[PDB]
Design an enzyme around this catalytic site. Sequence first.
Site, PDB file in Angstrom:
ATOM      1  N   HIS A  35       3.332  10.825   6.663  1.00 29.70           N
ATOM      2  CA  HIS A  35       2.694  10.666   7.920  1.00 29.70           C
ATOM      3  C   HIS A  35       3.791   9.961   8.892  1.00 29.70           C
ATOM      4  CE1 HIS A  35      -1.304  10.393   5.872  1.00 29.70           C
ATOM      5  NE2 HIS A  35      -0.986  11.641   6.376  1.00 29.70           N
ATOM      6  N   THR A  43      -6.154   6.494   7.743  1.00 31.09           N
ATOM      7  CA  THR A  43      -6.516   6.882   6.387  1.00 31.09           C
ATOM      8  C   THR A  43      -6.605   5.385   5.729  1.00 31.09           C
ATOM      9  OG1 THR A  43      -4.640   7.460   5.600  1.00 31.09           O
ATOM     10  CG2 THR A  43      -5.796   9.161   6.593  1.00 31.09           C
ATOM     11  N   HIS A  90       5.761   6.918   6.653  1.00 32.41           N
ATOM     12  CA  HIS A  90       5.214   6.390   5.374  1.00 32.41           C
ATOM     13  C   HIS A  90       4.938   7.651   4.520  1.00 32.41           C
ATOM     14  CE1 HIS A  90       1.575   5.985   7.460  1.00 32.41           C
ATOM     15  NE2 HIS A  90       1.053   6.543   6.251  1.00 32.41           N
ATOM     16  N   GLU A 121      -3.415  13.348   1.169  1.00 36.14           N
ATOM     17  CA  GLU A 121      -4.654  13.020   1.590  1.00 36.14           C
ATOM     18  C   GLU A 121      -5.593  14.107   2.453  1.00 36.14           C
ATOM     19  OE1 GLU A 121      -3.550   9.452   4.236  1.00 36.14           O
ATOM     20  OE2 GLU A 121      -4.471   8.615   2.333  1.00 36.14           O
ATOM     21  N   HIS A 140       0.940  -0.996   0.048  1.00 35.38           N
ATOM     22  CA  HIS A 140      -0.062  -0.001   0.000  1.00 35.38           C
ATOM     23  C   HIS A 140       0.922   1.199  -0.156  1.00 35.38           C
ATOM     24  CE1 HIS A 140      -3.053  -2.683   0.693  1.00 35.38           C
ATOM     25  NE2 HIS A 140      -2.616  -3.172   1.799  1.00 35.38           N
ATOM     26  N   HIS A 190       1.942   9.099   1.264  1.00 35.81           N
ATOM     27  CA  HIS A 190       0.973   8.926   0.212  1.00 35.81           C
ATOM     28  C   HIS A 190       1.225   9.892  -0.812  1.00 35.81           C
ATOM     29  CE1 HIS A 190      -1.505   6.794   3.305  1.00 35.81           C
ATOM     30  NE2 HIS A 190      -0.843   7.558   4.040  1.00 35.81           N
TER      31      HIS A 190
HETATM   32  N1  LIG Z   1      -2.244   6.846   6.906  1.00 36.29           N
HETATM   33  S1  LIG Z   1      -2.350   6.679   8.622  1.00 36.29           S
HETATM   34  O1  LIG Z   1      -3.454   7.349   9.012  1.00 36.29           O
HETATM   35  O2  LIG Z   1      -0.936   7.287   9.246  1.00 36.29           O
HETATM   36  C1  LIG Z   1      -2.213   5.001   9.243  1.00 36.29           C
HETATM   37  C2  LIG Z   1      -2.733   4.150   8.845  1.00 36.29           C
HETATM   38  C3  LIG Z   1      -2.631   2.579   9.363  1.00 36.29           C
HETATM   39  C4  LIG Z   1      -1.547   2.682  10.410  1.00 36.29           C
HETATM   40  O3  LIG Z   1      -1.289   1.169  11.227  1.00 36.29           O
HETATM   41  P1  LIG Z   1      -1.114  -0.128  10.434  1.00 36.29           P
HETATM   42  O4  LIG Z   1       0.169  -0.349  10.413  1.00 36.29           O
HETATM   43  O5  LIG Z   1      -1.893  -0.239   8.988  1.00 36.29           O
HETATM   44  C5  LIG Z   1      -2.019  -1.265  11.579  1.00 36.29           C
HETATM   45  C6  LIG Z   1      -3.300  -0.875  12.088  1.00 36.29           C
HETATM   46  C7  LIG Z   1      -3.946  -1.746  12.915  1.00 36.29           C
HETATM   47  C8  LIG Z   1      -3.452  -2.807  13.178  1.00 36.29           C
HETATM   48  C9  LIG Z   1      -2.054  -3.290  12.879  1.00 36.29           C
HETATM   49  C10 LIG Z   1      -1.462  -2.489  11.908  1.00 36.29           C
HETATM   50  C11 LIG Z   1      -1.086   3.661  11.027  1.00 36.29           C
HETATM   51  C12 LIG Z   1      -1.084   4.960  10.360  1.00 36.29           C
HETATM   52 ZN   LIG Z   2      -0.702   7.584   5.999  1.00 37.50          ZN
END
Ligand SMILES: NS(=O)(=O)c1ccc(OP(=O)(O)c2ccccc2)cc1
Ligand SMILES: [Zn+2]
Length: 260
Positions: A119, A198, A94, A106, A64, A96
Amino acid sequence: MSHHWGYGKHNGPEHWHKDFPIAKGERQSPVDIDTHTAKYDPSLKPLSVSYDQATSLRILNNGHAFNVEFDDSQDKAVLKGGPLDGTYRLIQFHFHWGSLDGQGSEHTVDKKKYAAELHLVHWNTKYGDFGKAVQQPDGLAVLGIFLKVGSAKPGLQKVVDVLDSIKTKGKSADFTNFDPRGLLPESLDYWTYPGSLTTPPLLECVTWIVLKEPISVSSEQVLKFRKLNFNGEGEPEELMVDNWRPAQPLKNRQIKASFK
Ligand SMILES: NS(=O)(=O)c1ccc(OP(=O)(O)c2ccccc2)cc1
Ligand SMILES: [Zn+2]
């Protein structure tokens, strides 16, 4: 292991609500930041970004985006102050980004889209681990930084140069001794609001802190982001571009400004 969401026409943002009904929740992210409607909050504190002891470990293509991961087993790289109470540890950052320089962020600012958005993800230490923190309304603090195309960002080049080694989903590489201070703009002026992840699972656990000042990156730096792949090795090539969720309804929220 059975997640099929992505950023395609058949599995993208418009479809996520079927597996993740919180997609239509009351505090989803990202949002448009209406600069004229955000109110200056003189009670908001300066942000405290303490990254001097940061320990980067690895860079991972997760299908992703790519995550630069940190040692979050001690208070080494922490975010405090601003709207936050307590101490939030950096776990990963990371980006986007878009297929074109005119899209990719975003968050938007007065409906303006930047070429990309960084982010820096932090979790509240009172919840012990990241997995527990994402289940809490004050579990995460994500520092969002816009990227515009112009001059190169010198502090980004080590990230750009390793991307060849993590082209496809599931590839990782050593990424020690990376200083995330090299990705910050001069000003820590920010907007803040309560929101969500997000990406699926879209959990409503984030205090968003979005910096007003973008960083500049070169056309060549963002071009290299766009050569990454969403697919695994030996699968049909799908360029990792337009991995952003559009702005979501603000609903019953106010965006606060730390400045003017
Ligand atoms: N794009 S953003 O909002 O910064 C984001 C999105 C998902 C995130 O966690 P994630 O690493 O996808 C995850 C979530 C729930 C359980 C395991 C892993 C972190 C930041
Ligand atoms: Zn993000």
